[PDB]
Write a protein that binds this ligand. Sequence first.
Ligand SMILES: *Cc1c(COP(=O)(O)O)cnc(C)c1O
Ligand SMILES: *Cc1c(COP(=O)(O)O)cnc(C)c1O
Lengths: 434, 435
Amino acid sequence: LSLRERDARVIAEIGRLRFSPLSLIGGKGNRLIEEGGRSILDLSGSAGPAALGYGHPAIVEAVEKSVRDMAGASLLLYPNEAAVSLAEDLLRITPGNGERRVWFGHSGSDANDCAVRVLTAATKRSRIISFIGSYHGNLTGSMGISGHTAMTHTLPRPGVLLLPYPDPFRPRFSAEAVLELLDYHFATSCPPEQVAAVFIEPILSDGGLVVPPPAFLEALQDRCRKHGILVVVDEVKVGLGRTGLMHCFQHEGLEPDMVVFGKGLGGGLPLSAVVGPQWVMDHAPAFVLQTTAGNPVATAAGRAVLNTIERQGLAQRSERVGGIFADRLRRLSDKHSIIGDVRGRGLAIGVDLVSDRGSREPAPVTTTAKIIYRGYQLGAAFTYVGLNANVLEFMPPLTLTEPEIDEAADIVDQAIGDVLDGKVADSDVAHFMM
Amino acid sequence: TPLSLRERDARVIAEIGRLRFSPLSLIGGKGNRLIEEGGRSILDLSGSAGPAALGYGHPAIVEAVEKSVRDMAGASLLLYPNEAAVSLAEDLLRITPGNGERRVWFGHSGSDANDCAVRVLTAATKRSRIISFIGSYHGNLTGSMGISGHTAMTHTLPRPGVLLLPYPDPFRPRFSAEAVLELLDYHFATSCPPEQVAAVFIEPILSDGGLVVPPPAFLEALQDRCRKHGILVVVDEVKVGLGRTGLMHCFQHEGLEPDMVVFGKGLGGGLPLSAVVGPQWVMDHAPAFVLQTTAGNPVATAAGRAVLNTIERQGLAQRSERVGGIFADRLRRLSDKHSIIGDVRGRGLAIGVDLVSDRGSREPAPVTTTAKIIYRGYQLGAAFTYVGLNANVLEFMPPLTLTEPEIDEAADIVDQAIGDVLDGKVADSDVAHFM
Ligand SMILES: *Cc1c(COP(=O)(O)O)cnc(C)c1O
Ligand SMILES: *Cc1c(COP(=O)(O)O)cnc(C)c1O
């Protein structure tokens, strides 16, 4: 009878990553409506897709116009005005030189699968450089190059070099030590001439919202590029204005050969894209096909996302409003010693929970999960990430308001204090742990 | 528009994402027709390859999409149950025969659904081997292409442990039903022990392989040979599913009782949506095993509910048998005028026309001739494609809402296009760019 109980009976566990009992019947602005009518503040952005919140007029108009006058349902078969104009848009807002082209897909997973498939074929090189903790997708091709603990049920693609992502909060490995490790692999067991590409998250997402040390990723890029290794930046998570600039890679001085877009590009509709040089992206006809990719409904939604971000200056606003939210969370740390760090850029914010500030020992996952659950009871939706399952993740809609930040901060404040005073029971969160 | 949409597409769209059969470049769509830039209204016999099951601007789909995008119940089923997606899953369980506990996973495409299927079948069964068919097309992502047998993906080696068998083809009958079963029995007795085989993947009509309907009883005998050893039986309904063949599921023509069914294309009505229906012990194998952020989002799943509801309410399975029969028969009678029409096969509104350079040998027509027929179709006001291991089978997958007057308009256009091409009235340079 309850939506949540119905879900339990028909939805497959393989597709669940559920942090709380929240079960939804609608949304409006930056709030989500639980079954029963309770209005929850969404600090999750549904993990990134909901860039403009829910029921946003620009996305609604674009999707209305397109589904009523539908310009086919397959870019592979038929050019349509929305998908071609979106590609034009993406080339216009993404700096780059030479001839470049755009491929469309449904998800970050399929866009990285495309990237891997076309890069290895255009180079006929089979080795790939990526990062421990990197999350590039959960389909066979994109999972295969990912380094995240969650996909260790399956072996990596052969010839993947996994490096530590240098972490300024837990600096086991300095930038310099990681580059030296790469250099040593290049001179030995991973000759750079047999490497197709390096894959870079400009902030390490599911690995724990780790902003790398300054200048490291520009130095990585330059080391790879000397050997004609193509430089791929995954902007799926932190892309499109969220970090204070249009592309997170613009913080890091990068000039990538290829950019992968997803999540928030769709504004809550499935939409991904790969932008690369024409010589790679025109490798062969009919090489990476999905029937409804580049369909006029999802692409029209993507055009509205980009248009709103530019016209309303949501990059600058994410810097300002994210600074406010970040600073509110830092102040909570004078109250709650479990807050060890507040990091990220703009409206991509992670809060690192520690059981001890000295050692920076991560707080146990049970505590982290209980804070989420308690936040849900108090009226906010969020999640956690990190290689130690201890980093609270805030990825709210870019439309988040200053009064909502106040509300968010008070909820987080209360949920931490409650959980630390033993408010939430083990059996309440057992359902949402693996 | 001096800068045509076609030209703009050439400047910015990746060739890897193209499978273009004509210059048709779109600004809209209405009913069963597509609107070319400049305004010309084209009859859609392609159904955009299957997704457009109810055509374009269909009011049930328009309504579901409007309500969901305006009042959006989150955008991620992996994070949050939503009413649309839970209800669609309930709908798919209800309309798909099956026994015991079952569950539903959602995705965006046939390719991601079959990737899911292969990943979870091997993991849950603890068997590594897969049975598939030569010419089968289960997708174009790494995991789904890996179990596929089609000639377009021979640029990449298959997944290790895949046994590829011929699909018995009544029109080019190199391999009988009995011969294929014998060959499988032989592999089972030697180098492919059947207790190491997770699953067999079955297209109930071989789609990109040439719209081949198997010989009667073959698929049921294949099911039984595999099931006898605990091999799970997977039917791919992505292409010919959901009423198009005259029954709700194409496998219901073939006496099949699958363990797992894969849906896509038309399920979404033009929005991206796929699904896998499987037994609970497989589908609940582990949490967070096959995740895609926006899968099961309330917009795409609402569109799917509208598709299924319209198909049941308006009786579109029953209609497609009747209307597809009329269309198929028009096409057959065209073989009296045009000897290039070697066969018309299919079920319901999944129809293939096999073009041959010789009626006796059944040698496939050259691909340049087939491309010219599509191009001339397009100029005459109809959009269609070709398929097949020899690039010679005209494909007709129109919206299930295709009208009887549109069937006459279609048959006439095809008739005129074949005639104009055979009489040497279509240039080589006009099709050069689509091959
Ligand atoms: C979420 C994510 C992906 C995968 O996107 P899906 O839409 O979940 O398949 C890929 N790369 C990064 C950096 C991500 O955060
Ligand atoms: C088209 C098709 C697929 C793949 O669907 P996409 O949405 O193009 O990835 C899978 N199986 C069959 C039988 C198909 O016809």
